[PDB]
Structures are given as structure tokens and as C-alpha cells.
Amino acid sequence: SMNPPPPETSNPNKPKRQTNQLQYLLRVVLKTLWKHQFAWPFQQPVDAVKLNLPDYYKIIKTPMDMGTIKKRLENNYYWNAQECIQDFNTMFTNCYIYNKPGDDIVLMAEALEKLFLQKINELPTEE
């Protein structure tokens, strides 16, 4: 039932880069999904206490959310685009693992994932 510490958004010894693909992931991918009508549940880590989901963190061992992704992109935490893409995929997968098909939260994740795939399809080549 307690909430774990949120995923790491700062790590000075972790190598980082600012590239055109990571810039695209913030400016295009991370803005398009953030502004969506169904973004709200995914804008911060899941609060297992407030949401009365005591089982959440016993099932979801790799939690992820757009709030964490936002901070990671803004504070230049990533080395490459694949690390960021993996975070988005982890967020959607966690939602599908914890919930059942047709659930409101699953429908919300599906709408965001559709857009995510549309935008990632246009990921620019590395400069």
C-alpha cells in the first residue's frame, strides 16, 4: 500500500546527450500526448494510496509516467531516443498488465499510444 520513491529523473554520473531525436521526443511526441483529453491519469506517478490500489506496486515493478518522462527530457537525462521510447512503452504496457480490456484507463492509454505510434513513425534521422 505505500508508494515507492518515483523513478530517477536526475543522476549526474549517468551519461547524457541532447540530440535532434530526443528534441523531437520532447517538442513533438511528450507535447502531443501531454495536451490530449486522456493525458491526465498519466501526467504523474500512480499514487497507490490516494487511488486505493494497494496491489499496484506488487504487480508493476517498472513504473513509468509522462511526468517522469517530461522531467527526464527537460533535464536531459537520456543518452538516446530508444531509452525514451522504452519509457513510453513501459507506461502503456504497465496499464495493460494491471487493468482489463475495455476499462476506461485502458481506452485512455490506447488513445495516447495510437498518437505515440503516429509521431514516432516520423522520428527524424540522427544528424
Ligand SMILES: Cc1nnc2ccc(-c3cnn(C)c3Oc3ccccc3)nn12
Ligand atoms: C487504474 C490505473 N492503472 N494505471 C493508472 C494510472 C493512473 C490512474 C489514475 C490517476 N488518477 N486517477 C484518478 C486514476 O485512476 C483512474 C481510473 C480510471 C480512469 C482514469 C483514472 N489510474 N490507473
